[PDB]
Amino acid sequence: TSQVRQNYHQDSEAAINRQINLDLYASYVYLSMSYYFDRDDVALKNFAKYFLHQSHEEREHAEKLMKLQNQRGGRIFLQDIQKPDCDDWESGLNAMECALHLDKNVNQSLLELHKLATDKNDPHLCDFIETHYLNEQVKAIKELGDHVTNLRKMGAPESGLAEYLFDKHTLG
Amino acid sequence: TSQVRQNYHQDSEAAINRQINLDLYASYVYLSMSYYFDRDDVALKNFAKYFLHQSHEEREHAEKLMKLQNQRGGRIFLQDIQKPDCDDWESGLNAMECALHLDKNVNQSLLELHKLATDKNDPHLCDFIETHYLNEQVKAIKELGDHVTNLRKMGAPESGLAEYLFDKHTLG
Amino acid sequence: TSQVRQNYHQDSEAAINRQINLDLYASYVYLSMSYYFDRDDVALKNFAKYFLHQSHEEREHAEKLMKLQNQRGGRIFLQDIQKPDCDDWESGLNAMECALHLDKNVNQSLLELHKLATDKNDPHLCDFIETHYLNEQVKAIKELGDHVTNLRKMGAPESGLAEYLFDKHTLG
Amino acid sequence: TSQVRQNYHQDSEAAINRQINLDLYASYVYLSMSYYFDRDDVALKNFAKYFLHQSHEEREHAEKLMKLQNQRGGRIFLQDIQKPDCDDWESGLNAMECALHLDKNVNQSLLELHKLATDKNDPHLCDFIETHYLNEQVKAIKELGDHVTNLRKMGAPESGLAEYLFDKHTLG
Amino acid sequence: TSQVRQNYHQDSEAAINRQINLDLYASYVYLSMSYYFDRDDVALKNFAKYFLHQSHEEREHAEKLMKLQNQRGGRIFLQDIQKPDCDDWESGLNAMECALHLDKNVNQSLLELHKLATDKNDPHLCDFIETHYLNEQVKAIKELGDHVTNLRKMGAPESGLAEYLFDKHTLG
Amino acid sequence: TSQVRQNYHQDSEAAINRQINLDLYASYVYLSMSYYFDRDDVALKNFAKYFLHQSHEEREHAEKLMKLQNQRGGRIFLQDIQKPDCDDWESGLNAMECALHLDKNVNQSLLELHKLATDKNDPHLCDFIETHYLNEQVKAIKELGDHVTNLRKMGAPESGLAEYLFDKHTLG
Ligand SMILES: [Ca+2]
Ligand SMILES: [Ca+2]
Ligand SMILES: [Ca+2]
Ligand SMILES: [Ca+2]
Ligand SMILES: [Ca+2]
Ligand SMILES: [Ca+2]
Ligand SMILES: [Ca+2]
Ligand SMILES: [Ca+2]
Ligand SMILES: [Ca+2]
Ligand SMILES: [Ca+2]
Ligand SMILES: [Ca+2]
Ligand SMILES: [Ca+2]
Ligand SMILES: [Ca+2]
Ligand SMILES: [Ca+2]
């Protein structure tokens, strides 16, 4: 038992390790998406930039959890970071839809983590999740929803013009 | 009778109170429109910004009338601010058409108020209305007309691309 | 169901709509109070300024809730904004006492909203209310209490001198 | 009953008074430690500076609680501030170990206070404790743990060289 | 016997420890007074600020004595800091009268300490007391006398207006 | 076949994909090491900082290869990023020794990649590897060798003092 450990349940420690992996996985998905848009036969530089930014953001979230783990006297246990489900992401719209799905899954995990912290009467962990993650996640989801709506209304994915103009005017 | 009151007819005092309510109502309509465009399934941020600006402008007009009421020794009597006729505003074009209709109704009220002030030989009130409101209203109406014309010519509301591009290039 | 919606109960959505209306109502009360102090037979410019500031603050609170509603995939439904209970607010002390009563009623609503969010296991909504509203409300109430105490100790409302000096030295 | 009081349980009011005393006590412990390191036969100026900083921090925490008490309409009741358990703190390592023990006891009190606020459905008080104290306390504990680890690994307390070098390189 | 100790009598060492406690006690009294004026039913912010400043000043005096103790090779022995005699300080005038009484008691202790240092032929200690404390104390007493006089002449404590105006114009 | 593809062998494309994975793996190893040194029972902040820097560097190398893949008309295929071989890295020296081993393995892969590019007469790929990676890798290896030597000479890992001082004076 760590000399710093206090009011930190074994289950919370484990759930934090799972959340670290999930955040790294989400970083990897966004990395994959980014470089798809960098392909010469896709060539949407601002979609590429957008998802690369998301990738780095997820990695930062992971690192903050690793810091939290140590702050509470828990022990970090890393797992394989799974390759994303797709190598080819189809279109800007499809990638945005996939990102929305991903962010809602990450949000579900955050909510379960918060439920667990609540059940274990760990107000420090509840506060940590609220402070750093819950509103961040709601904002991300809202933004992805907004992007999906605009792309659909513009005529994506069939309109390559729509995805081109969205790349310039929203993502650029 | 207020110690400051002079040449200020009871009817004018009452019409000013009605105009205060109408301006607050118009503020509320524009507030409603603004946040419609903030919905994730509408997502036109510059339409949202445009109508929020209009909302605050109408509130300022109301406050200036409340100040006028007191300046002349009249007494402010507030009424309920009615909820707008619509919760869902359909499209950017439809909202602009609705705003045009609203601004012309407010203009009609201003003109009737000016007629009343003229009939009561209240040149201070005539001047107040001319100075702060009549040209402001003509400019607003002209701008809304311009916006409606462009949206129609671009292919709104059926073209989601048209409303997207107008949001970026005119309202942004 | 909104593409962004997640862990957001129907009851919470409805309570948010009620809170939007209550905040707009509170904005309206403070607007009414402000311009009472602008009357030539009251003439306390800093009481006027104080309540106008409060009015704009309540409107901002309302707008932030409208933003929250959309962020979570809820749908804004606006209602009439009721006229305040008084047209004449009597004295600076009486208005401050009325403001205290109002702020405690708004606080009660916030607390019920937080209870509802807690009951529906919505930590994002709990956090939103805590972050933006609960401490703001406690500070407001404390300040109004302070003002009431000073006005009473100075001899308000019978001492017009007391209300004059408080206007200058506390509110100015 | 205070005119500002709302949703503030008698038990919470009392627990806040106990927490004020505990924070003042912790301020006193750290004051005692600081000046031990100022002795000519101890002479570790940066250990002295470190604990004096901690002392002032605990006093600030106490004052913020006194402010909270009044904000909520509670009434501050002060108690004797007990002298620390030791006059002589032995060594830098021993003092750090004692500080760790102290901070974990203060943390336990904070957690019990948060449990009480949770049980009394006082989300404002929960938020206050989370905002100002829980993460602050976790950071403090982590830092003290870090210091203890380094001092032990360096060969303290038997190595006067170790405590000298830690004073220079970590605390200086 | 400390390697630095020279011409420092056991009795002086002990009297310095008593003076440290008295200064901490005076810090505590002023802390208590400060937050009384922070209550919503007292609400004199500049009385609050004034006494908080005094509190910090007394703590600084205590710390300087702790430094002196070590400088001379004496050993600091801390005692409980007694809670102040009052929880409720009644009025601004009453608190000022209480502060005057306190400062004169502290002054009496300083004078006895100086007598002791004189009797033990300790010119360094005599000089320390003269330099840091005797004139400081005379100035404090004079200022408190001045404040009491003005408050009485203005009609305090019965005039809440008097205490309000003194808070603004002397303490603000 | 990509419209940009020219003189880019299938085998090279595949080896680039393997190198991307290896770089991501090396990023993960260094991430793991970094946060080990962040543990409260290890507490070497500059070892932590050093390895975190290395982690980000490896990720950048990976991203540059992903860019290269697309530049040449190859197709990125991502694989699982394997968890590092250790969860606990023992000591600063042991981690440095492990980093040296890792960097030499990465170097071996780079050299094989360069051999492959040479065998396939791909001077652009040879130049890319030389420009961005070969000298970078030699410098990294040299630095890690230097660090290992100093740690050993200082008496690590048995001397916790040695690792403490190296953390301060070399890594800080
Ligand atoms: Ca994101
Ligand atoms: Ca796999
Ligand atoms: Ca307008
Ligand atoms: Ca109605
Ligand atoms: Ca307010
Ligand atoms: Ca009504
Ligand atoms: Ca501390
Ligand atoms: Ca005792
Ligand atoms: Ca919270
Ligand atoms: Ca003083
Ligand atoms: Ca006692
Ligand atoms: Ca490197
Ligand atoms: Ca594996
Ligand atoms: Ca070359």
Side-chain angles (χ1 to χ4, degrees), chain D residues 142-143 145-147 149-150 153-154 161-162 165-166 169-170, chain F residues 38-45 159-161 164-165 168-169:
Chain D
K142 178 53 166 66
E143 179 170 277
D146 290 352
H147 290 351
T149 291
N150 277 286
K153 292 220 180 235
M154 289 169 81
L161 189 60
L165 288 173
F166 186 84
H169 297 317
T170 295
Chain F
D38 186 60
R39 286 168 55 158
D40 76 272
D41 57 0
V42 181
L44 289 165
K45 289 175 190 138
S159 180
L161 189 60
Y164 174 91
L165 288 173
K168 300 295 188 185
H169 297 317

Side-chain angles (χ1 to χ4, degrees), chain C residues 30 50 53-55 57-58 61 103 136-137 140 143-144:
Chain C
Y30 276 126
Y50 183 81
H53 173 86
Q54 304 322 321
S55 180
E57 192 158 59
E58 296 299 309
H61 290 171
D103 280 20
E136 287 308 318
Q137 206 65 15
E143 179 170 277
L144 290 164

Side-chain angles (χ1 to χ4, degrees), chain D residues 17-32 55 58-59 62 66 77-85 102, chain E residues 21 23-29 31-32 55 59 78-84:
Chain D
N17 285 327
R18 296 197 303 273
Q19 190 70 49
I20 291 163
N21 191 260
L22 181 53
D23 285 359
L24 294 174
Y25 175 75
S27 190
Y28 207 19
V29 173
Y30 276 126
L31 180 58
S32 180
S55 180
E58 296 299 309
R59 174 156 173 167
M66 291 173 73
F77 283 100
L78 298 173
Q79 301 302 336
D80 297 351
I81 306 165
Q82 297 303 321
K83 73 161 172 64
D85 283 337
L102 172 64
Chain E
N21 191 260
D23 285 359
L24 294 174
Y25 175 75
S27 190
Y28 207 19
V29 173
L31 180 58
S32 180
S55 180
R59 174 156 173 167
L78 298 173
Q79 301 302 336
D80 297 351
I81 306 165
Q82 297 303 321
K83 73 161 172 64

Side-chain angles (χ1 to χ4, degrees), chain F residues 30 50 53-55 57-58 61 103 136-137 140 143-144:
Chain F
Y30 276 126
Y50 183 81
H53 173 86
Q54 304 322 321
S55 180
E57 192 158 59
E58 296 299 309
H61 290 171
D103 280 20
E136 287 308 318
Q137 206 65 15
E143 179 170 277
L144 290 164

